[PDB]
Assembly symmetry: D2
Homo-oligomer: 454 residues x 4
């Protein structure tokens, strides 16, 4: 639409697109921060809407906001949560470091929509005010960190943790199914003493189980909310019960264990909970990178690599493309951790103003890890299968089973056999027969890989 609606603030008049619900502050931000393409993610927009919905409810309970306005604001917020207003949030990540401009974006959109819900219009004549009504009892300084933690905790609980549990279950099933398949070990990339494919996969399972615990340990701190600290942490001008009531209301409407932060100065001056929680996510990235690499190396071939397992072929030579997407996003999480650490280390005095960047990286890492585990699970892990003949060919051509001979012929003769096999390019069996130290039936009876794995 070309038509505009004129709005005015202390700097003068500014035109806003007539078909949009935002106002003068959003327009000024969008015009002054034309930096790259990254915007607030939907998860954060929704968390801001939840925050305003909870504040409106508490302000009504406390007699500070009328029933008619509070109900209209909550209904507008529910429309945002239902996906009806995604194009009303145009602002860049690369904005004011407190997130003030996105706070005001939500205030303006909810106020103008609430006005319409009460039979009014958008703009200067609206029936609901962005600051006096939608932002009542609030500061950008406590709202934005609250929305950051709401988005982070819900994404961890609802997306990442369920996908981690699902992938863990799949690999545990595979570990049990392949518990009796002996294969060659590899240490330093060199052939080593055997273990079962089930045992090797059980290591991946144990990694994912440990990662789940580390992530779970990070959740209580992310559940602490800044809301009620207002501008500098003192809560100046708020009702004494407001901070607890709004955390309680957020806990009710999200079904997640939000609590008010015990120290609002820590809550405003730092992003420490997210620095710590992201530490657990970069741990998960290091574990997934290792699992993904084992899978693609074990499946390498079809003739000039390892080839011990097969994986689903999802494209019409076929490459381990799910493993590649996963290893790439694991690198991304490691970079994101550095950006988060720099922002988290850079607070000054009463406020950390690196917040849009910190939450952009944090929520990206959660999407990448959650969706990457989901994709790797359904398009790779559920279909891993052993190549039993290839596994046995490698085991039987290795030199590593020679220790099974020690109890029968002694260490010196076993070592002589292995040295001859290596020097002359023979199997252990062929070298042993060539020296006359045993018969083929003896070799087959004594060299039992299933007895060498514990």
């Amino acid at each position: 639409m070309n038509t505009v609606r004129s709005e005015k603030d202390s700097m003068g008049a500014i035109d806003v697109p007539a078909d949009k619900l935002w106002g003068a502050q959003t327009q000024r931000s969008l015009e002054h921060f034309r930096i790259s393409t990254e915007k607030m993610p939907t998860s954060l927009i929704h968390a801001l809407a939840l925050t305003k919905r909870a504040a409106a409810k508490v302000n009504e309970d406390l007699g500070l906001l009328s029933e008619e306005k509070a109900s209209a604001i909550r209904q507008a917020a529910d429309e945002v949560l239902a996906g009806q207003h995604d194009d009303e949030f145009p602002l860049a990540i690369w904005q004011t470091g407190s997130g003030t401009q996105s706070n005001m974006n939500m205030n303006e959109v909810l106020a103008n929509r609430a006005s319409e819900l009460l039979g009014g219009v958008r703009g200067m004549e609206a029936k609901v005010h962005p600051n006096d009504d939608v932002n009542k009892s609030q500061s950008s300084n406590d709202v934005f960190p609250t929305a950051m933690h709401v988005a982070a905790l819900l994404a961890l609980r609802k997306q990442l943790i369920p996908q981690l549990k699902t992938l863990t279950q799949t690999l545990n099933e595979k570990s049990r199914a392949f518990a009796d398949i002996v294969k060659i070990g590899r240490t330093h990339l060199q052939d080593a003493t055997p273990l079962t494919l089930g045992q090797e996969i059980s290591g991946w399972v144990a990694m994912l189980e440990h990662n789940l615990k580390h992530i779970e340990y990070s959740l209580p701190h992310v559940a602490e909310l800044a809301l009620g600290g207002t501008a500098v942490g003192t809560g100046l001008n708020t009702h004494p019960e407001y901070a607890r009531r709004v955390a309680d209301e957020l806990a009710v409407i999200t079904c997640a264990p939000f609590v008010t932060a015990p120290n609002k100065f820590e809550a405003l001056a730092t992003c420490d909970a997210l620095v710590q929680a992201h530490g657990a996510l970069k741990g998960l990235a290091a574990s997934l990178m290792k699992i993904a690499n084992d899978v693609r190396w074990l499946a390498s071939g079809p003739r000039c690599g390892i080839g011990e397992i097969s994986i689903p072929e999802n494209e019409p030579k076929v490459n381990p493309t799910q493993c590649e997407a996963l290893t790439m996003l694991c690198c991304q999480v490691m970079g994101n951790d550095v950006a988060i650490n720099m922002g988290g280390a850079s607070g000054n005095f009463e406020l950390n103003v690196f917040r849009p960047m910190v939450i952009h990286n944090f929520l990206q890492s959660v999407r990448l890890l959650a969706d990457g585990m989901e994709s790797f699970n359904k398009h790779c892990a559920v279909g891993i299968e052993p190549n039993r003949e290839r596994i046995n060919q490698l085991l039987n051509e290795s030199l590593m089973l020679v220790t099974a001979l020690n109890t029968h012929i002694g260490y010196d003769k076993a070592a002589e056999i292995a040295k001859k096999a290596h020097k002359e390019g023979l199997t252990l069996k062929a070298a042993a027969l060539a020296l006359g130290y045993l018969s083929e039936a003896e070799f087959d009876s004594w060299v039992r890989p299933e007895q060498m794995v514990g």
Copy 2:
């Protein structure tokens, strides 16, 4: 649109949206890599289109592709470059690590559109073939690194370097304008011997000048193109002149100094040129972070900080919001460098398959630095002004001018004056008068900051 068009590949039939120009391979990728929200940026899509346009021209020159098909492919590519097909590229960054799927996305879109341009239709009956025609003489393995370098070099030359030069010129103007304004120095955050505001800003200018040289040094390696190496670097099945001809054609159509990579094995197996070029960008980020911090600290106040300069107020208390956006994106560049380094270190054998991730980070850093410099320049740097009275108040209340007394009254008496001023909370002048060591006219004649800056 709900209606579909059925296409078939070696895996069977797959439905594609009837209103889209992509084909079966793009559809399979979009369905198997539903990971997060990051997609190929427009710059990379355009670079892929340029690559196909150049290949079509050379294939025609060499008698390998008909005039009618080559001309139609070039016209379709020009439509992409003109912004007519942005919604035809739906694939995630988090795809196959070679970028094969985005290569095929461009092949399918250009083939189907070229078919329409020749009076045909989209789909199985198209008059132009994605592989046999649009991908003729090519592999994903050489196309994708070529598009990466085309996008990177053009973004550096056309966006980042011009914005760097513009910001440098603005700060040089400010340095000259303020060359005679003496202010207090600060080392370790402590008051120190004086320098002019122009001298301090000249440091920022010299930083940006040095950064431009470092960036310029990185351009020749990025200008080397993999195209012609085909699958593993040998160029098997290509015309002997093809590699040089296609680099020449890209140089002509872009007006940039592209050349064929002297070693195609390096060109396919690594992202080394981008690892090195991004090293220069993280240098720029460290310099910009320092400049932005000096600006916001020098402007801090209005009464309880430093307050030596004023900056434009762009929002209706006013915060240094351009400095905050810039410091945040500088942190992002540092994280992006780590992701790039991990991907660049992780090639195996004939191909690096961390490429979508590397180019996603690299092009993001270029957008952030280019657009951030542009925004900081027009919304902050051009309007920096001294607060002359505040500068003089700080200089006159400091203890640091006391050395101007040494030549007149001797070091011992000057040190006694400074010690008394510090202990008793006095100005140097008041302490000197209290001791009877000089008159007020003598102090004003001897303590000349304009004589203490070289």
Copy 3:
């Protein structure tokens, strides 16, 4: 000057006055990279690991009492600082730590031989592989030593220093609870809070960091020993893994347990990647606290100047009052180091293959360095800076009362003029005849503005 020792590769000259053997000698020839060596914490953890293995092997009837006791006595000498010059190998060695495992095997074997009345070298009465390395692989020994060193350093160095610094700052927060100062957001003047409130944020940060570090300890307490070469424990006694973790717990007084999955324990450094995540969180918190201290102390006349800190370095007689915040500089520098070390650890931890992670010397070098830096940095910052933080009460009150933020206290009773004309709020108000010299003193109470 030399004796001739032997390994599977042939004869090699070894310094006669050293206790190491052929494999350590060869390592010195092949890994001449930079200057970083195993830190004392890791050497001690390796000695403890060998001491525990010797005891368990004796209990299981696998090693004679005379040899096991001599090995344990030699290990005690290492722990007592008597053999620091016997461990010359670089960090930048085989990625499993094999070379340092053999360094400890050879030193302990040769010293144990002497304790039994024998000599060092080929004729020794105790053997590095057959006796000191019995039941063990480098593959499970090195990760065990890594976790022993890490857990003990966290419990004995880092956590005590963190608690000590937290207590100091808690005392300062209580002492300054009534001192009202100007808030700062975006570096700009903002509404008031007390100095005690601001310091309470630092305290709460350190309290939260302690909890995060404590949550990382159970995983680090899991030990690989008993997994042997690939995790199966092939050729080891079924009770050995549990027994050796129990013995390490006894001799160290720390809650070590055998790792429930030896494949995870051998194939990854995951416990240390996670624990270092908590340490980089502490680094980000300490960076912020140290920056607040140095900015609040900036001056003495052209910065903020709200607090004073101890002056520990001599100055120039002609620049009295220039006090560089040198403890804050050491601390911010080491916090930057911890962030870099985290990246190095993450790359190594992401890079295991199959049955073994072979980035281990580098991972533990970084991890133990971060622990020393954070522990010693917190000790130094506490003793030489934090304990001496004091308010500059006159300066605090000058900034608070000359600011424009207190104007909000006039809302319920009835600024641009003060700002544009360079006046105080009271001077601008009286000039407008909107109140008096008693109403302003009555209505504008900063101590009522921190609730």
Copy 4:
């Protein structure tokens, strides 16, 4: 056992058998953080800086010939390794490097006093501040020493080792130019190339890295000396900055110049942030080369096994043929270290304020460590691995000919069956009667497939 020295803060006991003075003593009391100290390269660069300043001060008539010569002789003793135990200070000190500047001032002053027939301490004939530090500030001395150390280490250590390794790999590439092997993309079998071609990629990587490192040298050659406290050079001779850069260029034989903008030189570590960018590029290239070597050598029976590498460590007699790629492990570990060090450097370089960057000891600690790691790592990898790379020709040909990739050679004349039935291409073809035992040998020529 002790002597009593004095600074502006009072009297302090100093070890009688040491050459440092009061300020170094105080630093030892206040900066007891970890174990990292100034590296020898930096101590030497500081001594060279003082040697040059003494000569220029003498030329300008500011320092007596007898004192200047004695200072220069004391500096030469430091450079000759006679005073390594006189520099005890931690990296984790004042962020300008003041403490280490004073350490060198005190050691040189006390030794110069002895050379003039005097004593060390209060009665010394040469003064640390008035004589050894004349015309200087810690603020411009420390960045000068940083750049002197960095440029000389790049020119004398790193670049020669890079050239040596490149030459070795170039020889290998030429020697193996005719050995056709299977390509691998995505870890999967792919069309052929020669072993020489694959190695030529490693060579081209190292050649490109050399150019990038060379491009970083001009900025590192710019010296801060002469900017004094804040960059203005207040109270220094107008020719001093140029003269002292010229003298450093003469005595080091390297192209040092005075920095054209002293404010940039004091307020940033930008030249080192940029130069380290090129070093992390080299680390990413060396990681890839080292990984190719160890994967190509993997086996001896259940990996790739296309090349052999030297066996440098003794093995078990019962595991002949297990050759761990230990040089590749040391090299990949140190490459991970360089990546972490880059982050630490970037944070320090981004963190200057106003006239001075005070993250300097940490920045130079990381930078010089990366140089040692890369230089010594390239030396070790060259001598103990790269020079001995050899093809396993039978294994290379077995993998090449049993693969499915060569089927494309049949296009212009006329695979699924071979793959599904476990046959060679020739066996599957003959079975289908699509060619013979002579046509296949004629049409499928891998040596014609690398053009």
